[PDB]
């Protein structure tokens, strides 16, 4: 019988490549999404057309609130309800926007940025662990630039630092169950086309390896390795996939 | 005219030692507290006996909620109300208890450990910046053992990692305003009186330097250094004060 | 035709497993060794029996000295001599023994610990890059998951392994324009000497959160294979811990 | 009676500022030097004029060779000869120049960059330890940009990483003797007097805190703090004194 994985924020961009690559490797997958319903549903169709009964969809807001624990439990539950098991969790979903220290409320900024990037990953991790031969693991989408943060993204960066903390703490705490917890830390990948050519190339010119952003597939490759049998002794590790961007001084 | 400082969770233990050492250095202090009313006024009493009108108390719960931003604004506001300025913020209050992955609810556990250790510091930092030959700085109380966490303290540890991220991001963004932002990372300090001499010795003997815990004063000494004119070019630095504990492998 | 790799200290233990796995992946291999000549030739024979003309040995002392640059240069040269190319360098060879701060002279200690763990890796990287000026060129340095929590009395070893982290980063940055990726793999406790005491063996096993045992050489090798592969093409400057959570365990 | 200190590369720039501060705080100093004999002897003279026989010079090449151990031992011996004791060692001397991976020979680059930045510090540490109300400590001059290194400075950068491991390894190992081992990590300080101001400003503009390099004195202030009684629980720590520079992404 095939293993199953939950991928958050999986309707597009990096989460989609991850869900696609896990599916190609043999996984059944739960495509979590928030607002991208059409793309989630359309991906589920694509994957199911390739192999029947291997993909479902689960909508949830991962903003921090008093009902976030039950939503995270719902997400993990979908995977069991559809597939009867849950082997892999990929914490990919993430809010990302500036939150200057000096038009949505600060409460909402904290809830969105800390909820998606950290608290939801923690609650999902609880629900995953609570519901457990096997190769169980969690992969958290972290950030190669966490120690050289973008100006005015303090809550995003707090969120991501907290994700590193969770990766470590859950790796220690869940190792007795044979659940590995690791991370993949992208540099720059999938530049928005909202973005100017000048600004894109300015970012591209900073990357040592190839003067280019990562493709979503390259990020997914790292995730796949971490869940694979070739990573069985690896827990609490964060693999940068940044083309050397973080090594470049100001 | 004396500078003024806010110390969070200043009624006892490390916070009190910070507030005390700041006051001796010539600062007027706002002694924030949550539950320890008696200890807080008893400290302010004592400090005011030495120097008239140089200390006030200020009660605030620093648990995360939709009113937390107003609470943190009010703490900063209290310093200005009493003293007409706010030069120094020390983020010291911290909730601390196990939150296993497998009768506080989890929503409460998230709110208290992530609110106190991270979100409240963010919001106090926002409010501090917003209100501004000065020497303005923030010092965050961090944790030297953040990369080798205690078992079943994932939320606490998430919050302490988030505080590192804030220290860095805020150091960066507030540098243009002359506000330095730094941390002190204690090891083991002030063992609970509750604990048996067995368990105390066990922690003590882990410390390479002298097999003893840090005194409150030793922690305060590092804080005072960071706020002083001797740390004028220092920003985004976190100073361990751990007697070498973080270096000791398992 | 098949790519080629140099693996230093490859006659035995972790380097042997890395050489094996690269070979099974399709690489031709230079098995470098220092004293373990019998094991090296045995290993070359066994790989060549599997695919004729795909393995050579190359003997060298990697202690620091005024001729280490020439020795490191010759190791690279011998992969070009045998196979016409050098696609992968794995810096694995390493001297490991206490050097307390309070038989061998201290100058010998310095030369061996810093030479093998850091300076030979630097010099081999230089030679590798120099000889370069359908290809996936990379270097993998065998680092150490425990470097920020060192063993007591192992200061020169630790200084070496920290230096190697630096080389990994500096070389990643500098060799990126040439398409040469540089990365690390950082074992925890792995492949315990069968010789060492069982009691001591258990002591260390018991410390590892994941499975309560040491890594197998093959587990370390898996991470090298990943980093040299086409699935790691945007990865440079990274060090992958393969430690079962050992570095996360406080005192 | 007064404590004594060995400062390596103390004839000029940051070393000199450290020697002077230490002396101003009450230390007797050994002014080590390599080529700057005029500046070394002249410093010793200015300090002795201030307090009789409180300064001596000591010349030594700290390039790695077969004689470096004896040279390092003779440096410590010079302290005991002059003052009957040696309480503090500051590892400051450092070669710094590019060594591209692609007319000194390479073995001489290795010898100088690794000798001065790591191996001499190690040997000086050994001889210091061997020779031992007491406050004994070592401050190693590290580098805040070690993880974002300058292009083509691999040997320097290796040397400075190595110096981090020494700081850690030696802290752990010498704690039982009450010898603390810490470091200070400048960003950019004391730009070359010969570098064009227009080049100098390219670096200054990178610094968040004040768009300025550190003064020699600002770096020395951190050293003074680490050697003081205010830092008696601090070992294994590296204090950045970098104005934010290492937080700035490419
Ligand atoms: N792109 C990069 O260069 C880069 C760099 C560093 C780190 N990373 C990390 O790698 C991961 C993927 O990056 P990405 O650029 O592909 O991410 P992204 O597209 O910015 O976000 C991925 C998904 O997160 C989901 N999301 C956002 N807010 C949410 C909420 N409140 N509740 C639930 N889901 C929410 C969205 O789902 P819907 O579309 O369904 O609304 C979105 O599609 C992220 O964790 C990111 O932080 C990426
Ligand atoms: N002690 C150590 O060994 C150690 C180790 C590593 C890091 N640290 C860090 O250094 C700092 C000081 O440590 P400590 O042991 O002195 O701290 P603590 O005694 O555990 O906590 C300090 C204060 O935080 C306040 N606090 C707790 N929950 C709160 C809430 N929901 N709202 C507002 N305030 C709240 C409490 O105030 P009231 O009493 O007024 O209720 C308490 O007096 C902390 O930030 C800590 O994490 C300490
Ligand atoms: N085993 C672990 O738990 C562990 C933990 C952390 C890191 N690592 C790292 O992983 C790598 C491999 O580990 P390992 O245990 O397999 O290594 P090892 O057995 O200690 O050493 C591997 C080989 O290094 C070679 N070597 C030693 N001194 C040399 C010299 N002066 N010149 C040339 N070669 C020399 C030896 O070759 P000959 O036999 O031919 O003399 C030896 O077989 C090392 O870089 C190590 O630091 C291992
Ligand atoms: N300046 C910065 O911005 C910066 C940045 C990061 C780190 N740091 C570190 O902070 C420390 C002081 O920096 P700095 O700029 O003041 O250093 P520096 O001027 O570059 O060099 C300090 C002294 O090192 C001595 N030295 C050089 N080669 C030597 C050798 N082969 N043997 C013995 N001594 C030798 C020289 O002594 P003589 O003049 O007597 O020959 C020189 O005056 C250094 O460790 C440096 O790496 C500085
Ligand atoms: C120039 O185009 C981009 C800029 C930023 C992101 C991005 C990052 C990110 C953070 C720090 C950093 F140094 C580089 C990237 N984290 C992100 N997290 C999420 N959920 N979405 C993103 N789109 C990003 C993606 C593309
Ligand atoms: C053995 O007696 C103690 C045990 C823990 C703490 C403590 C820590 C802490 C965290 C990790 C670690 F390795 C050592 C200490 N963080 C803390 N944070 C707060 N707000 N209060 C505390 N009381 C502690 C204080 C004394
Ligand atoms: C309990 O039996 C072992 C003890 C040490 C090693 C070892 C390490 C190592 C260093 C620090 C640490 F925390 C764990 C392992 N580095 C090594 N490096 C080399 N070149 N060979 C080795 N044999 C080792 C292997 C097995
Ligand atoms: C802009 O003018 C300067 C450039 C370099 C240095 C310098 C550094 C350094 C290293 C990395 C980095 F990102 C910045 C500085 N390390 C040094 N080490 C020594 N022994 N001397 C120095 N003179 C420096 C000083 C001034």
């Amino acid at each position: 019988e095939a293993p199953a994985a939950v991928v958050t924020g999986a309707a597009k961009r990096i989460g989609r490549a991850i869900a696609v690559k896990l599916h190609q490797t043999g996984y059944r997958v739960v495509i979590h999404y928030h607002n991208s319903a059409e793309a989630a549903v359309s991906l589920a169709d694509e994957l199911n057309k390739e192999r029947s009964n291997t993909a479902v969809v689960c909508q949830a807001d991962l903003t921090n609130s008093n009902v976030l624990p039950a939503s995270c439990e719902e997400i993990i539950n979908s995977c069991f309800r559809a597939f009867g098991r849950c082997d892999v969790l990929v914490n990919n979903a993430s809010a990302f926007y500036p939150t200057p220290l000096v038009g949505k409320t600060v409460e909402t900024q904290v809830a969105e940025l800390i909820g998606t990037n950290a608290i939801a990953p923690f609650l999902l991790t609880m629900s995953f662990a609570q519901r457990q031969s096997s190769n169980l693991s969690i992969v958290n989408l972290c950030d190669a630039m966490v120690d050289q943060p973008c100006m005015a993204f303090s809550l995003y960066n707090m969120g991501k630092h907290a994700l590193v903390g969770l990766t470590q703490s859950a790796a220690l705490e869940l190792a007795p169950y044979g659940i590995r917890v690791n991370g993949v830390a992208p540099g720059v990948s999938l530049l928005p086309v909202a973005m100017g050519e000048e600004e894109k190339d300015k970012w591209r010119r900073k990357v040592p390896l190839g003067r280019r952003e990562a493709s979503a597939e390259q990020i997914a490759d790292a995730v796949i390795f971490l869940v694979s049998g070739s990573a069985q002794y690896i827990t609490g590790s964060i693999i940068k996939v940044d083309g050397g961007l973080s090594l470049v001084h100001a």
Side-chain angles (χ1 to χ4, degrees), chain A:
Chain A
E1 207 195 51
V6 170
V7 185
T8 65
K12 55 173 64 119
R13 294 168 56 83
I14 281 144
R16 181 187 173 111
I18 288 163
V20 167
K21 210 166 274 271
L22 287 172
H23 187 262
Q24 285 168 359
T25 309
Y27 281 87
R28 300 176 282 168
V29 302
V30 173
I31 289 137
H32 160 279
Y33 82 90
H34 181 200
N35 293 320
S36 292
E38 192 177 312
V41 163
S42 169
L43 179 62
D45 178 66
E46 258 202 68
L47 295 190
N48 278 317
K49 294 328 279 213
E50 191 64 34
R51 283 206 308 288
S52 320
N53 298 310
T54 58
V56 300
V57 130
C58 184
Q59 201 276 336
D61 189 2
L62 296 176
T63 302
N64 186 44
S65 81
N66 275 342
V67 312
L68 182 61
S71 320
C72 295
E73 193 166 29
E74 175 191 4
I75 287 163
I76 295 303
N77 248 279
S78 309
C79 188
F80 279 94
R81 288 204 181 190
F83 306 131
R85 52 197 291 177
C86 184
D87 304 83
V88 164
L89 171 68
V90 180
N91 284 305
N92 166 85
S94 166
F96 176 71
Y97 50 82
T99 50
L101 292 171
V102 194
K104 48 214 319 194
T105 57
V106 79
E107 301 94 82
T108 293
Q109 289 171 41
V110 172
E112 283 180 359
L113 282 151
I114 308 294
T116 59
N117 287 293
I119 299 172
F122 161 88
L123 296 165
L124 286 159
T125 289
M126 281 185 84
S127 284
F128 185 89
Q130 189 65 35
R131 303 254 7 212
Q132 318 295 329
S133 39
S134 68
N135 186 26
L136 313 173
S137 83
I138 300 181
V139 183
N140 296 328
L141 270 93
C142 298
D143 184 311
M145 300 296 281
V146 95
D147 296 319
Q148 298 126 275
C150 297
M151 176 64 92
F153 281 80
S154 66
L155 290 168
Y156 166 79
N157 200 51
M158 299 164 62
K160 293 302 185 191
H161 270 271
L163 198 49
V164 172
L166 175 61
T167 300
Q168 293 168 335
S169 288
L172 178 64
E173 186 168 343
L174 304 181
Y177 303 91
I179 305 162
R180 301 179 299 102
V181 193
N182 294 304
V184 170
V188 283
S189 181
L190 298 177
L191 311 179
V193 199
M195 192 154 279
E197 288 313 295
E198 80 298 352
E199 173 151 38
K200 282 183 229 183
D201 290 330
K202 203 273 307 307
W203 281 94
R204 287 171 177 141
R205 279 198 320 279
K206 297 176 192 181
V207 174
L209 192 59
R211 306 293 169 201
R212 58 166 279 262
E213 67 267 43
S215 75
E217 191 196 351
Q218 286 167 330
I219 306 300
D221 285 329
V223 169
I224 294 311
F225 164 72
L226 283 166
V227 319
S228 87
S230 303
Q232 302 290 241
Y233 198 68
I234 304 178
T235 191
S237 290
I238 293 171
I239 303 172
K240 295 183 291 172
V241 188
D242 79 342
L245 175 68
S246 61
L247 308 175
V248 181
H249 63 63

